């Protein structure tokens, strides 16, 4: 029934999207596929902790505003407004990651995958990071030297002040 | 001069209902654009009712 | 003479009308389709909200 | 801005559904004014005791179908089939009173109103039935762990039909 509604997003949900998406609800998996992408989307709902007004932030986030707009039906000028008053469901960590990983360029990332069994995106390489237990809502040092063996100072400063000081 | 008559008379049936059309179409608009407040209004309250929702104590 | 010419331009001009109203309807389906989907994009916000409560006071 | 809803719906209401209203939400008030109505609702919005689905069933409740496809923009056959498919946020209780508050003819009203009146406890005697139920609960008389005061009021009022449904209703 509104299952539908969920699959229409997945289905024109961006490939990169995908990545920021399923990040966002920490249900992450690299480079996912349509039947993947939707499956996971399907069990946060089943489960109850895919709202909503989640999804809405979660697709704001993600750049989505189209989205937001044609398909759940909210104006993205309202939402701004309104998440601009609010907790955000997202914590401060996960959206100074979303922020790095839209302002790499095609050299940092083409230059992340090589300096690094696996990763192929940004969001893949923190999602290992975050496996091997090296990078975390905790401590972001590692995440704060990798921007330095890219010469994105003006990133690593960035994120600095996203989080500690 | 009676099928011209027979004309302005057609057409007048023709120009009545196009009034009466756009004057519908006003008021559909009007409730359109209250659903789009309504709509937003829920969101509004279902999203803050959750943030509220959540608090631990002893 | 002209009375045949006469009719032309009331029959053209009448149609010229019939269009509009013809074109007019159509803007008024587009429109019933958006308040239809507005509808019950509203009544599934309101049953996602409704059932979350009585999750909330369950548990 | 939200409270302009919940105004217009209070202002709209009935001399009657104002007091099925405040029934519903454990909240009651005798004969009640626009302004202890309204005043009674927001400040159960102010504390989010008052949520739209609420508010909505509430209405729904006291038949009032026309505030919801005009006020808060529910199809009436929507909330129908919705509220048949999950569990009421008003209790058998609530839901039986009302029931019965609004089976009620005339000659029964007429004939409540009078055979109480002299009501112990009572601060004015009643002039509806929930007034009445009202006062009975306030005597520890009423109440969903025992109706048995209410089947007595109704096989005296020769409404045994109500007196069967109350006992289908409740059980046993």
Same mark, same amino acid.
């Given at each position: 029934?509104?299952?539908?509604?969920?699959?229409?997003?997945?289905?024109?949900?961006?490939?990169?999207?995908?990545?920021?998406?399923?990040?966002?609800?920490?249900?992450?998996?690299?480079?996912?596929?349509?039947?993947?992408?939707?499956?996971?989307?399907?069990?946060?709902?089943?489960?109850?902790?895919?709202?909503?007004?989640?999804?809405?932030?979660?697709?704001?986030?993600?750049?989505?505003?189209?989205?937001?707009?044609?398909?759940?039906?909210?104006?993205?000028?309202?939402?701004?407004?309104?998440?601009?008053?609010?907790?955000?469901?997202?914590?401060?960590?996960?959206?100074?990651?979303?922020?790095?990983?839209?302002?790499?360029?095609?050299?940092?990332?083409?230059?992340?995958?090589?300096?690094?069994?696996?990763?192929?995106?940004?969001?893949?390489?923190?999602?290992?990071?975050?496996?091997?237990?090296?990078?975390?809502?905790?401590?972001?040092?590692?995440?704060?030297?990798?921007?330095?063996?890219?010469?994105?100072?003006?990133?690593?400063?960035?994120?600095?002040?996203?989080?500690?000081? | 001069?009676?099928?011209?008559?027979?004309?302005?008379?057609?057409?007048?049936?023709?120009? =009545?209902?196009?009034?009466?059309?756009?004057?519908? =179409?006003?008021?559909?608009?009007?409730?359109?654009?209250?659903?789009?407040? =309504?709509?937003?209004?829920?969101?509004?309250?279902?999203?803050?009712?959750?943030?509220?929702?959540?608090?631990?104590?002893?």
């Amino acid at each position: 029934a509104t299952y539908e509604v969920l699959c229409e997003v997945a289905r024109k949900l961006g490939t990169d999207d995908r990545e920021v998406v399923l990040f966002l609800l920490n249900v992450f998996i690299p480079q996912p596929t349509l039947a993947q992408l939707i499956g996971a989307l399907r069990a946060l709902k089943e489960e109850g902790r895919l709202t909503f007004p989640l999804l809405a932030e979660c697709l704001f986030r993600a750049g989505r505003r189209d989205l937001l707009r044609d398909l759940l039906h909210l104006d993205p000028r309202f939402l701004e407004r309104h998440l601009a008053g609010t907790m955000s469901y997202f914590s401060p960590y996960q959206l100074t990651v979303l922020h790095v990983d839209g302002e790499l360029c095609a050299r940092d990332i083409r230059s992340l995958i090589f300096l690094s069994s696996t990763p192929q995106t940004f969001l893949h390489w923190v999602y290992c990071m975050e496996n091997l237990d090296l990078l975390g809502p905790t401590d972001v040092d590692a995440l704060m030297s990798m921007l330095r063996s890219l010469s994105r100072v003006d990133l690593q400063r960035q994120v600095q002040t996203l989080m500690g000081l | 001069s009676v099928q011209v008559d027979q004309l302005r008379m057609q057409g007048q049936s023709v120009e =009545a209902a196009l009034r009466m059309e756009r004057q519908a =179409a006003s008021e559909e608009k009007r409730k359109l654009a209250q659903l789009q407040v =309504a709509y937003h209004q829920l969101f509004q309250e279902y999203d803050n009712h959750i943030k509220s929702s959540v608090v631990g104590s002893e």
